[PDB]
Every structure is written in structure tokens, then in C-alpha cells.
Design an enzyme around this catalytic site. Sequence first.
Site, mmCIF file in Angstrom:
data_model
loop_
_atom_site.group_PDB
_atom_site.id
_atom_site.type_symbol
_atom_site.label_atom_id
_atom_site.label_comp_id
_atom_site.label_asym_id
_atom_site.label_seq_id
_atom_site.Cartn_x
_atom_site.Cartn_y
_atom_site.Cartn_z
ATOM 1 N N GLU A 126 0.844 -1.189 -0.187
ATOM 2 C CA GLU A 126 -0.009 -0.158 -0.117
ATOM 3 C C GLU A 126 0.810 1.126 -0.218
ATOM 4 O O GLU A 126 0.755 2.005 0.789
ATOM 5 C CB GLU A 126 -0.952 0.083 1.217
ATOM 6 C CG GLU A 126 -2.111 -1.006 1.261
ATOM 7 C CD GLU A 126 -2.893 -0.914 -0.115
ATOM 8 O OE1 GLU A 126 -3.034 0.141 -0.779
ATOM 9 O OE2 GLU A 126 -3.691 -2.205 -0.571
ATOM 10 N N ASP A 127 1.728 1.444 -1.208
ATOM 11 C CA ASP A 127 2.422 2.643 -1.001
ATOM 12 C C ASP A 127 3.627 3.026 -0.178
ATOM 13 O O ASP A 127 4.030 4.169 0.217
ATOM 14 C CB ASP A 127 1.900 3.806 -1.258
ATOM 15 C CG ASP A 127 1.053 4.114 -2.711
ATOM 16 O OD1 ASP A 127 1.724 3.369 -3.726
ATOM 17 O OD2 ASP A 127 -0.048 4.500 -2.735
ATOM 18 N N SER A 128 4.354 1.980 0.525
ATOM 19 C CA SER A 128 5.236 2.265 1.410
ATOM 20 C C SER A 128 6.522 1.593 0.784
ATOM 21 O O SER A 128 6.644 1.030 -0.076
ATOM 22 C CB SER A 128 5.070 1.646 2.690
ATOM 23 O OG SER A 128 4.828 0.336 2.577
#
Lengths: 146, 65, 188, 84, 164, 114, 263, 773, 133, 36
Positions: free
Chosen positions: A115-117
Site C-alpha cells: 500500500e505505497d510504502s
Amino acid sequence: DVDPAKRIRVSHHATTFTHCEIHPSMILGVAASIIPFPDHNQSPRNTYQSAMGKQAMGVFLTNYNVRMDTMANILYYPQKPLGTTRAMEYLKFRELPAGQNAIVAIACYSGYNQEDSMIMNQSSIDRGLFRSLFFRSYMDQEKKYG
Amino acid sequence: MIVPVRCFSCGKVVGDKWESYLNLLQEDELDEGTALSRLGLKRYCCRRMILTHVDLIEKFLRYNP
Amino acid sequence: TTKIPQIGDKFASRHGQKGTIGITYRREDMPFTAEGIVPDLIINPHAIPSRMTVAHLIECLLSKVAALSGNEGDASPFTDITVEGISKLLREHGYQSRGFEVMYNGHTGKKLMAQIFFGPTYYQRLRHMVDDKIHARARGPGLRFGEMERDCMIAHGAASFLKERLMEASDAFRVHICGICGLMTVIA
Amino acid sequence: KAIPKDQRATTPYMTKYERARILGTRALQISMNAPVFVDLEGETDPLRIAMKELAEKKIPLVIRRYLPDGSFEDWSVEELIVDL
Amino acid sequence: YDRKVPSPTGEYVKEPEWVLETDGVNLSEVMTVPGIDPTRIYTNSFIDIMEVLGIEAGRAALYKEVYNVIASDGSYVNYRHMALLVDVMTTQGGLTSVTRHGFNRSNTGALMRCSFEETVEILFEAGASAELDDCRGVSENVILGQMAPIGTGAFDVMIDEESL
Amino acid sequence: MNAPDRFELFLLGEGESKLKIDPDTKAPNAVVITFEKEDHTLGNLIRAELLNDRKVLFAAYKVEHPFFARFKLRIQTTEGYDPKDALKNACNSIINKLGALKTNFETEWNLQTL
Amino acid sequence: EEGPQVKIREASKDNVDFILSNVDLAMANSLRRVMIAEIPTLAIDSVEVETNTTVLADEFIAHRLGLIPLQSMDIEQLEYSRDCFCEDHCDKCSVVLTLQAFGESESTTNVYSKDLVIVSNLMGRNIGHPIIQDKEGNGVLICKLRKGQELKLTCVAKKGIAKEHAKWGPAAAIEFEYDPWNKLKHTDYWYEQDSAKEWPQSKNCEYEDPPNEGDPFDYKAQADTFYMNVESVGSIPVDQVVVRGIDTLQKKVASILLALTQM
Amino acid sequence: RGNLMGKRVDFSARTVISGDPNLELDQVGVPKSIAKTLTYPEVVTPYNIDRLTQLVRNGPNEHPGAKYVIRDSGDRIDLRYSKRAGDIQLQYGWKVERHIMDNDPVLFNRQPSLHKMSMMAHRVKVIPYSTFRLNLSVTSPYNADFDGDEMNLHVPQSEETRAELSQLCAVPLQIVSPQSNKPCMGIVQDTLCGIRKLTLRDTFIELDQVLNMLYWVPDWDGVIPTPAIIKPKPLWSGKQILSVAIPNGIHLQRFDEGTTLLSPKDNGMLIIDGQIIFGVVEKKTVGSSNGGLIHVVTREKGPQVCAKLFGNIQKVVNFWLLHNGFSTGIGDTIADGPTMREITETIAEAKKKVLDVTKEAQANLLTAKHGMTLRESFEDNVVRFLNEARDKAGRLAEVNLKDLNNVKQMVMAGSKGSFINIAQMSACVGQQSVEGKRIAFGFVDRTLPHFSKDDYSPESKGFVENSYLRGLTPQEFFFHAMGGREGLIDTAVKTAETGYIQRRLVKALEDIMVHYDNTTRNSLGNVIQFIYGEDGMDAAHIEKQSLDTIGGSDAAFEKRYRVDLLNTDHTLDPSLLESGSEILGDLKLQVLLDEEYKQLVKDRKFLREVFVDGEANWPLPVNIRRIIQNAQQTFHIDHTKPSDLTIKDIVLGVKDLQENLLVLRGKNEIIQNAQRDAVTLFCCLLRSRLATRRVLQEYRLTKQAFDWVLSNIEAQFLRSVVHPGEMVGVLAAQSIGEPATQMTLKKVTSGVPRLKEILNVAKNMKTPSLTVY
Amino acid sequence: SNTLFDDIFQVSEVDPGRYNKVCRIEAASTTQDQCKLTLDINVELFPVAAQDSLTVTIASSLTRSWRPPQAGDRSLADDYDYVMYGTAYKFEEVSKDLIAVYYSFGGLLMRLEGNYRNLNNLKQENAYLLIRR
Amino acid sequence: ALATGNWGAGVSQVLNRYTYSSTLSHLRRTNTPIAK
Ligand SMILES: [Mn+2]
Ligand SMILES: [Zn+2]
Ligand SMILES: [Zn+2]
Ligand SMILES: [Zn+2]
């Protein structure tokens, strides 16, 4: 007889031409001129980038040590991007860059980058990757009419 | 600012190859790729370190105080 | 002040997608390439399909070739550079032309069943860092609890919580009231 | 306005809201050193003990359910069937 | 349009039918035209449906409209939620909108969130009309230091002199 | 600020031991050992060797959370065979294994010119 | 000598191309990791700054200082300051160095690691000498001085390990490969038209026999024969990185048997 | 009023969030530094004198510490400054303000919170570094990602308040939500991509890695499952180990396109007693889907077991994925050399159809479609041609890609991806458009100065022929940016408009609650619904079920339900029933069986009136099919021997049960009718599921299994009735507004604009239409 | 202490369908023309080709965790080569007059079709599958 | 006016200096006060 890898362009059915574009990439402004291969991105993503380039850390000026401004962020080891642009030359990006060339792996590794990390190399951090200087300066005076 | 001491990725010492690299270019008129390979920088992680550096200190030194 | 990359800090490539450091790993633990090359950064492939950010992928391919040959990569719009073109150059350098490389797991040494798109890409460190927004306000003697937050607690039916959280400091005063007139005109 | 123990048309079952409030009320008391009505086979956390009292129907509490018109019914925690 | 219909053998079958879609509305008059099925005529103007077919038909239509706005994105919402909304908009015999009608109220208490820097006036009128505050809201009960008669507080608890 | 000191990765803090041995209940002849201040380097190692022992019925390890430096090792062995021993065995077996490697290397080193 | 067996291909002051055979992949790896993270070394871990009129910031310079590889041959004859019984640092656990530089000429004056000077007593153990490998005995370029600018620092080398900070790492990179001919089938080659034609054949394919067309999958073959190559950074002789790698790993397990013991 | 707007937010913290595969679904990682700041007042008691005494010694600077000790007299002793900080003797009744510790219940929230599931209660897990950490599957209910999002954590301050959170708000009690009568939490991203790769037939695991995987599942019972392959190599199936993460008693059946009991394509899904028997595990099984594995585990094992389920699965798959790897590169967006040619021709064929219609129009041969302009219908055909092209061009690329193709692997699993994406990246990008039309003549009679006037071709008016891979020409680029801007502009609108609509809905329904009479009312006491949802049921307890009575031919209806004891052919064969032979020709029983059939025939009529459509699947409480699949597994019912059920057992049994499904209890006539009405639809499902032939012929229930089925249905049903005190209004408002904050984009008015038009009761609609039959 | 089925089959087809280690074989039975078989096999550990002749024995013996060696020196109840072990999610189709049964080997499926097995096979999980030469 | 942005506004602003390109950008920016 045509390069199947090239993009599909139209034909020159003209004998009326009165002018010719110096170069089509000049329809872009400063921020977008820094996006590599902008013509291969979905349109809104180019806009997002143009906003973020203004939130990057670089070397806003070479005389930063002598100016005394509110806030400042200077990257330790700025690098010129391996993938440049022709317009990038008149923008002095290679001279006063922002960011570095990170060796990047696109992969599902420990699961800690969903999730976008991101998973960053701690050893690279020790050796100086992405460190930056931060300067904040406070001001203050003395009285008024009294 | 100046030549990072080491390659961020592997650790290779690189802060001792900046001047040499500079000469390999000027006085020997070699190209960056051939120049870099002669300095021993074989893997791209180390190559990018030198090939991408920007020596802004040489501009800082130009201010009087 | 010197600021060192930490968990929670923001980073982004030049293709409209930022991210925060979720965790950091040391070299030993990172996955590796036969040449012993290790990544400075690992992003997730699930962030690729939907963004439609093909340029990021091509910048990578291009950037690998540039590093391997000491030439500046041209990522200028409206030119004749191609993925096929770039793939050919990278191949000449002995690598699999589409950016993939065999990698081994750092905890084991054993190969990965899948190959990994590996290469350099330009990344920018953004401002606004963790330690600047960590604000924690607990006084005993965003971050607010407004109308929307309250509607949620009402929906959950958590009444006393709503009472506990919405009641002010003011002292719980004791008054007497007539049962006929609802007024505080009772002499006690 | 009270309704006789017979004629109550309300649910024989305890609602999740009643369970939540009873456990919370009882826990509060246990948190203030009030006498407990069960054997603490090791428990020390009030709410956890309260839950034990409920399961063993040893909570001397009554729920007063009001109807929109004003009348009401009284159900003992003991009576209430606990299945949620 | 295709139409699922019971065939003579019993199983549903598709039976295409010609339908007319218009730009403009005059339900009462078209409904009366010979040659149509007045039983099935429809219009996305739930306001006209109400005026010609009544409030119950108005309700049904309002639900069909809200429901389409949610199905248009493939989204799904359990029936009761939209139904409750549609009943509230319909309870008083007419189509009462929700996007803020009253400058003072909807269903509150002359105590809940003091609106307009002149709450004073909200109270002045409450006094002049003998407004009766039910005290079921959350803010009114917060002002009173009590818990609202909702969910966990929709009943009282008492000691039981039964337990042996 | 919240980051723990780096030396906490290899230095046992106070009150901690290099090993905590606990008896597994789910099964007979099973133990669960907790290695404090050690990671995959020893974990996958002792695991692999432990697996070369035939009188060993179970061996697996895992670091539950990368934030902390510690892993868990569960060993199950044949009745009569103490798990604690299989460990000692696996260890010694490893130590020897390396000693030989060490030699062979220092040997081949000399035979090289440069 | 029955067991793991080394078979060196190349060797120099920097690399040690070799072939481990007759061993568990797990051991090849643990050893591979140890070399990267747990071999003791000396490195600047404290800088006191008297004067810096340079164009850089103190912590900026200090950071580089720590990255400068130092002589760590007899590192074992040196103790970790945390174990040492003194108060802070002493000759028993630390090497003190100094850096004094002044922009004398009008031309830009460079400061290198060679300009570092040991001030403590090395008591005869080869340690703390700034490593130098360039063709001019200069070492790493620490800073640059304009005429008039100055730099007076005081460092303090200490024993450490990579796990604590990558500056204490003696290794630069570590090539590692096995089953160059994908026979164990540990990986599944991604392809467009042809697995074989699209994937570059590696060095080590020469040192092995390509599988035969009709042979059924060998399901009992394990992973032995690992092709490694160690690159030293200079703080220690290549041969040592390996050797001590095996050593520390050895002491590790030892610290455990001793745990069951006094347990 | 300044305090009636939530300002002085005491006992709460805020920070950036990060995902964490090693936290349990209901936990929240709280950085140590924030844990030392937020306190909970705990009364000194003998159950906690030591722990407290110890915390007070650690003080305000060490984590398991405390900030203040308060004595009887209400005095506040400040542990940070106080000559006796280290010399305090707690006494029963005093209060110690300690730091929050592992397991305290805290309220976690992400704004804008327009969902109850955006404010749930978690168990604290004190961890090092700054930033809060979340399990990945708690991500969507919060609508959160990790590119900088920040969340708030609030600490309940009293004992009754702690209980309220953990007994009502706790994450586990929210897995199955009422907004759409399905789970709102499922397995995502990495774990989804991995679970599929793990379940393929080709996936086998060796002993060494199996023992680790097993050990990774915390609820494992040290029992190494026997290999699916024992032969020359003890090899385990990928399905085998995943099955260890699933608890016992879980059954699941679903058939896809061409799934058989031998599903060649490894299609469908069949789990029995917690062991997946066949089918690849992807989004349809492990996602937030309706009847999926999470819906089931919840209802069957309870909220806590389900919460643990997410973690167990995550730990196995994430481990199997860390050692298998997955990636994606430019390679995955490249289509076959011949495919690209099939694509270029497909588009070239589109440009011809467009060229023809133009010549047609220029000669004046096109006929306008009624109520449409020449130009209007011209455009229409051109756009239809151009989309047909992009689309068929896209399918050619989709079909090509192999099963190795990473983009395709992600699409097959359910994790991020979609046709349109693969289509624009690999094949044609397509036609751009602003305000529903092709690019307009902004310059006089032309789109750009580079074209000639009156040029309506596809390249002129905005068709982007290239894929993103190939790159766009400059004109294509500008047009794609014109279209792009549109989306950015109204994305800002949609955003703003939806936020105000959501706050108006809440305001309109806030006071509507379910009272003890099962009535739904507002603050005044007025009746809105005489029974909530017209059925008294709680939406989180409703599932889509198939009302069979309504479908198919009558012959089929009769073959299925008809029992004629008086006919050698249409009777129950004596093999399905024990008393089968002596039932033949039984007049009295046949009277019972005719009552049951007439009722089944009425039901069919009834249903066909309610669902004039013919639709058979409708959300209803109590999943009968599942209850029966349980019975058959629980009593190891052998489908070989005849049942010992009597016809009176079934008929009279099912008849009795119906009198027990209670929603209302009032003893008068009105209520009893209301009660019969509310239970009508469910009873039709019931009677068709428990018809005599079905029970004996299909299910084969024994008298024991059957009696078990009836009591379960009653238990579950009663467990499905809505609880008085439910804030149904706010629940309703949010259930409608939340998804209306997800709408982004055949000529009418939909989306937020129309919704606002509705809620406003506007007399001047934008698209007043009439539909006449 | 048992055995449940025995015979030899005529492999008429070996389909690998997009898999790289598994194939779905459908071999007819020597003797009785009724008896048929469809089965998933890990070809990597026991290749198979058309017209081959496999001998298939079911059995159910020689659930407690599993051990690796030792027994390899003892109860060698493996007089075969390929050896699986699945469960019977058996749908006694009771098709027409014949009776087919289904087994599941960790996902590798199997289905026999005959009639005289009414007292031959199980109706419960446990069941090994053996094949030789 | 030059200190505020008060002409007849926000017409005058503090020059961005976060990055060099951000400065160039600010100096070539346009504003439109208040059909499409
Ligand atoms: Mn976000
Ligand atoms: Zn490098
Ligand atoms: Zn009075
Ligand atoms: Zn000392």
C-alpha cells in the site's frame, strides 16, 4: 519497412506550411520538463509530479550558507539523474539537482512495502544515502514607541 | 558536495578516485565509461556513484567568507 | 540539523507516486544479485498496473544502460528512443534485455523462484518528515474529535464514551428543582 | 409506567448494548475494590472478572427497558438469555 | 429492451419489447394516450409520480432513483438503508427534501449545537411557542452532563433485590 | 528518537539470557528455544544442521518481527533422545564443519600467486 | 580434508574468487552474511572539532571521517571500549588521530586521509593507519580548503561491527552463485519466446556440465558447489575477511554451547 | 459552542502510518514515545498493587511507567518533579496514571471518518520507531494507504468506557458490516498475489520449508500433515499447508464457469473440514466477497477466530512469498510481435470505417436517426467505431500475455489491475474526450494550428492511437492532457459535493433509532417504519440466498417437490426412507403431503408477484445451505443407507419451527399478523429448503441431523434480529454517503450531481425523462 | 492392514494444460471395458506418456505427525514407484448403473468409474495411491 | 502593496526557494481571478 517499435505517427499531406515547431517538447513548462519520458505516462500523473518536484530537497542556491532564511533543506550528496531531458539543460538541473540515483528493486519481499510504502537499505543510509541538512532561523527585535 | 567516501550500495571506497577520474577525462581524453572501468568501478552501483556526482564544493570555495 | 532517512519519511520518483519508508533492512538481509549487487530501495509491483506509469519502468531500463556505459540517458519526450532500442543496448552489456535479474534471498542464500526488475531510478526526498507531525496531546490536570467522529460513535451506540469525551471541565453542581414548575426555585 | 412480569413482549434475549453497559458498570465496581461474587480462578482484570460473573449469572442487576410511550419492562440480568 | 417473462411451460424467457424514452415530462397527459400500458409508464421525476399516482407510488419511485444512483457505479447498499432514507422523506405525506430546508431545526433541541451566533433567538422563539425538548440528542445531554438515551444508554440499570 | 540503539542488535540487555528453553505442550519430545540477540545467520544454520540428524522429528525457526533481534527454534526428537542434546550435537557438528573449511581455505590460499 | 572444500580461482590484495563445495547452502550463506556484517574493525567513531571554517558542516565532515578505512590487521589485540575498564577511551581500546589543515596557497588545498596523524600509543600492533590504495598515496579526499579556511579535528577510532554501522564493514560486495545451469530448478525463467536465448549464460556455466536433453528431473540433487568472490575494502587483507568470517561464525555457535552449559 | 465542536482533544495522538505483516488484525503499533505521553487512570487494588507499584518506580521516562499518583484527597503527585518520586507507597483506592500498555483498548481513526468502520477499537502493541502500524487487511475500512496518511488514536478514560470500545467497536466485531451485508475486510495485495501462486497445482513444498511454514502458524498443533506425495520424494502441496491456517469445521462450495467435481481448470473452490480439496485460492475465496471464506469463518467460528484467521494466513503466505518472490517490469507490458501487428491492423480497420462514414456524410447520404442531428449521429458512429477498436485491440493483448506475465498474475489474483489498464499500456490508449465529446474546434474549425480546417478524422479530433509503451505523439499528448484535466477538475468537485451531501444525510437521520417494540422512530416518537427494514433483521446478519421455488419450468418444480404416496412412480423410493415401503398408498399421510405441496405452489405464485423479474437470489438471514452442509459433515451422513425420518417428522417438524422464528412477541391480533408478515419471505425459503423430497432425496438427513438443523435455524434466526438501541439512522446515512464518496467518471444524469438533485427534491431536473411501455 | 483396489490401465491421453509439472491422464482399464480412470500426476517425479501401461493399487495402510527416515529401512510397504495420499470427497455419482468415486491428493484430483467397488473403496479420507512401472 | 498583494488579491508572494526548479517555476506562474 517501418520500425515496429516506434510510435505511430501521421503523414505530411501539406504544401501549405507557413511555419514549423522549433521542437514540440517546448509546450511544457519548467516542472514538467523534468519528468523523464512524460509522453509515456497517463496524463494526471504528470500533473502530480509537477507538484511534488516542488517538495523535493536539492541545492536551491550555491550561496545557501550566506543567506539567513526561515527554512532550508540541502541534500548531502546531490547526484545528476542518469535519465535526463534536453530541456533540463537550460534549467540547470545537472548543476543544482535534487534526489539521487537509487538502485531500485521492484519486488514483493518481506511484505513491509505494501500500500505505497518502501523498504530502504539501512546500510546505504549509513553510508550517506539521502541525508540532508536542515536549517531553521529565528528572528527577534526590541521595543516600539514607549 | 564532494565525492562520497563510499558507494552507497556496496561500500567500495570511491572517495579516492575523483581526481583520477577527472584526469582520465581531460589529460587522457578518454570517455566516462572507459574511464570508469579503468578505475575499477565494474558494477553499476559503484559506477553511478562517480558518474553522477556533482562537485558543488568547487563553487562554494568561490565565496570569500 | 542533519536529517537521516527514517521510517515514515517521504520519497518519490518523478512519476507522480510518493511513498514512506516502512522499514529499513541492512545489506545482509536484503535480496541480492549474482554480482553481489543489493538494492538501496525496494518498491511494490502492485503499485504499477493501475498507475499506468510506464515511463518509470522505461527510465529504469534506460538508467541501467547509462550507468553501464557512462553515457547520459536521454528520456526526452517526442524522440525516437525505444524500449527495443534500449533493450538491445542493455543486452550487449550481458544482461537480460528487459531489466530482470536473478536474485537470491538474504536470509537463506537460496534463489528466488521469480526474477526481479532491478535497476537505478531517480528518487527525490520530500519534506514534511515523521518527527514533525508526531504531535501527541495528552493533558490530565487533525487530531480533533468533531461532528463526523461523533456520528461514528453514535452509530456504534457507544453512549458513555460520547459523554466522557464531550463533557467539559465545569464542576458537577447540585441543584434542587420543583416537580410542578421545572425551575430552580427550591429553597433547601 | 411499569408492566407486570407477565405480559412483557420485549425480547427474552439480552442486547449487545445491555451486555456492554452491564459489563462496564460491574467492571467499574470491581475496579474500586467492591466485593466480587465469583471464584477468581486467576483473574485480576476487572472487566475480565465481570465477564466471569455474567457467565455464571451472578450479577444482581436489573435492566429497565423503556418503551417510546413511557411505559417500561424490567428484566433481571439473571433472566436474560445471553447469546450474541 | 429485453424482458424476463414466464413462458407457457413455466421457465422465464426473454421477450423483447419496444419502449419509448422521452425528453421532457407530462405524465398525466401521456398516461392517458391510447395504445400504451398505463400500468407500467414511468418517469425519473418522482415529483410528478407523486402528484399523479400518490405518495406511496412517490416513495417507490424515490427509492428506484436513489437505488440507481448507487447501482450506476456497481456499488451495493443493503435495502434498509435507502429504505429508511426514503421513508423519512415521505412520512408527512409529501416529498420533504434533506439538503437543509430549515434555518432552524430538522429534528434537534433548543440546546443542541448552538447554531448562528444568535442562539439567543432560537431560545426566544422556543419560549414564545412553548417548545418541548425531548432530550434524546447527544449535545443536549452533554450540556446536561448526562448520557444520551441512545444505544448503550437507551435503558437504565438498577440493583436487584432478588439475587440470593 | 524512538529508534533503539544499534548495539541492541547484538548486545544482551539486562535481565536477558542468550537462551530461554521452554517445553512445548502441543507435542511430546518438543522444545522451543528463544535466542536473544541473534538473527537468520544462526537460525537457518542450526536449523539446517538439526535437519541432517535422523533422530530429529522437527526443526524450524522464525523471527516474529524484524524490529527485534531474536528468533525462536522448535525441536522435536525421538523418545529417549533429548532435544537439548540434538542442539549440542548440531552445534558441535557445525563447529567442526567450519574448522575444516577454515583449514582447506588457508591451505588453498598459500598455493596462490599474488 | 573431508568436508567443506575451497578451490581458489583468482586471488589478489582485493578479491578472492573461489569455489566452496561439499557444504549446505545454509552454511555458505551464514558465512556470506557474517563477512558482510560481523567482522570486527577499527573506525573513527567520535570527532571533536576545534576549528572548521571550511565550506562543509562538522557532522558532514565527521560522517566522512568514519567512512575512511583504517588499518585493522591486529584488531583482535584491541578491546571494545564498552568492555574496557577505563573511563571512556584509552590506548587499550582506542586509537586517537588528528587533522590539522590550513588553506595556505591561493590554489585550492585538498585534505586527504594521509594527512591524518596518530597521536595515541599503538603499542606495536598494526592498527589505525589510514588505508591507501591510490596510485599517489593520497587516500580519500576528505575536504577542500580555500585560502584562509581552516580545519582542526580530533578523532577517536574504536572497534566495531557492520551490524552497528556500515562503516565498520570490511567487505565491499560478495558475489554468490550456485547451479548456474538451472538444474535444481530453483528459479523459473521469465521469457518472451525462448528461456535459453533470452537469458545470458553465466561465467560459471563453464565449470559445469549442461544437463542432457532427455534426462528426467533429478529430484534428489541438493545444493553444493557455491561460486563466491570476496572484495575487501582494505581495512583487512582479503584472505582475512573470509578466514575471520568462518572464525566469528565459529565463535557464535561456541557462545551457544557455552550457554546450554552454564545454563 | 467552542467546546461543542471538539477542540480540547485530550488523551490522543496523531502520526504517519505504516503497514505491518506481523501485527494481528485488531492491533495497533504505538511508538514508545507516544505511549509514554498518553495515560490511563487505574485505581489501586489488590489485583494490581505490584504492577502499579512497579510502574510508579519506572516513572515517566521508562515505558512501563506512570505520570502521576493521586491520593484519596484528590492530591496529584507529579512523578517527574517530586522529592519522593522514588519513595511512594500506593494504597488501595488511590489512582495511578500509567502509560498505555500492551492490550489496552484504544480508538483508532482516520479522517474523513464517514463510516463507523473508520473509527474502530484496537489492542495496543508498544513498539520502537515513531509512526503507528496497522495490519494490512484493516486498510480498506479506513480507506488508508501509506504514502503519508496520518491517523488519530484516542485513549478511553474510564472502565465503562473501556468496555464500550472492546465490546462494540473492536475490529473483529466489524469484519461483517451492515452497509452491504458482507465483510468489509479481506486479504489484499501481497498476500492475495501470493496466496494464488501458492495454490496452483504446480506448487509443491519440500519438507525443510514445510516445517518452517507450519511453525509460522501460531495455532498449529505440532502435527506434520502427511505429504500429498510420499513416493521418491516427500512433497507437500501448496494447498496442503494453507489448509493448516483454516480451522476445523469450515466447509465451502462454489462453482465457476466450467467447474466440475474434477474442475480441470482448478476452477471453483471446495473446502471440507478446513482442508481445501480443489481450486486456486484467489479473490473470490479470500477477498471481502459475499459467501467467501471470511464471511463463513466469522459466522461459523465467531469474530475472534476470524480475526486470528487473517493473521495466520498472512504469516504463511507472506513467508512463502518472501522466498518465492514476485516482480514486474517493462517486459510485462510488451505484446507478441505478431500480436502488435494484429493490433495495428485492427486500428487501421477502424480508421477505414470512420473514413467511409465521412465520405458518406460529405456526399450527404447519411440519414439522421430520429430525434438526432446528422452531425450528432455522425459523431456517434465514429466514437462507437473508435472505442470498438481500442477494446478489440485490448483483448488481443490480454489473450496474448502468458501466465508468467506478472501483470496478468496480479489481475488473476484480484490485487490491483484491470483490462482497461493492460489495454492502454500495451495496445491502443484510445479516444480522449471533454464533456462527453471528441476534442472541440478551439481554434476556428480545428483543434490545433497543425491541422487543416474542417478535419473530422480520428487523429484530428483526439483518438490516441499509441499505447503508453510506444509513447504519444505531441498532438496525442496535448489531447490526452485536455481529457486529463477534466478528471482533475471534477475530481475536486465530486470531492467537495460528496462531503456536504454526506453531512446532510447524517443530519436528517441522526435521531432515528430502533426501540424495544421493534419499531423505528425519530426523537418525537413518530413512527417511520413499523418494524425496522420491514423484517426486523440486522443487516450484518443477512446473506444472499436462492429462492428456488421461483425458478425453472413447472415440470421441474413438480419433479423436485411432488410426493405422491398414492402412485408407484411419484412416491418416495423405499431406499431413501426406512419406512419407505409401508408408506406406499397411505391415505392419511398423503393428506399431509398435499398440504405441503399446495403451500409450495402458493409460495411460487407469491414469489413470482414480488419478484416479477424472476430473480431468485435475495439477501435473507440464516444461510440454510450452509447449516445443512454442516449437518452432513457433523453426523458423517452416509449417502448410501435409507433415512430413519418419518414423513410426519419432516412435514410437522418444519411446520412447528415456523411458529418459533420470532421477530415480535405481542399477544394481540395486530402484532401476530405483523409477525407473520415479517417472517413471510424467510418462511418461503424455509419451506422450499425443507420440503420432504428434498430432505430425503437430496440432503439424506437422518432424524438426528435433521433435528439438529431445525434448532440451529432457530438459534441463528433469533441471533439475526436487530437489537433495540441501534442507531439505524446514522447507520443509514453513512451507508449511503460513504460509497457516494467513491463515484468517479447512456445520456442521463447519474453520480453525485443526480443524487444531489434527488435529495434536494428539485422541481427542475436536468434530464426529465418518461419511459412508456 | 489392508488394500482396496487393483488393476492395470491403458493411458489414452496425457494432458499438461498450462502446467509444467502436472498432467491429467485418462487411461482405460485392461480387462473390464467399464472401469476407467482420470488422474493428476506430478510428471517431474514420474513421467507418463500415451499408450503406456500403469498398474494402479489403492489400499489404505502400511493421524499422528510422520516421520522421515528409519521406516525407510523398515516397513517398506512401497512395492511401487509413484505414491500419493489424498482424501475422498467422493461423490458416489451413482451414475446410470455404474458407480464413480473421487479422491483429492493435496489438490491433485482422481476419479474412478466402475460398479463392483461398492464393497471395495472407502467413503472416508485416508487412502494411498500406488503406481509401478 | 508589494509587501501584501493588495492592488485593487494575492498578487505578491514570498518566492519559493525549496529547490532551484521550484524557484524558476514560481517566477513563471500565472493566476486567474474568479465560462470554462
Ligand atoms: Mn494516501
Ligand atoms: Zn557499488
Ligand atoms: Zn414550583
Ligand atoms: Zn579503555
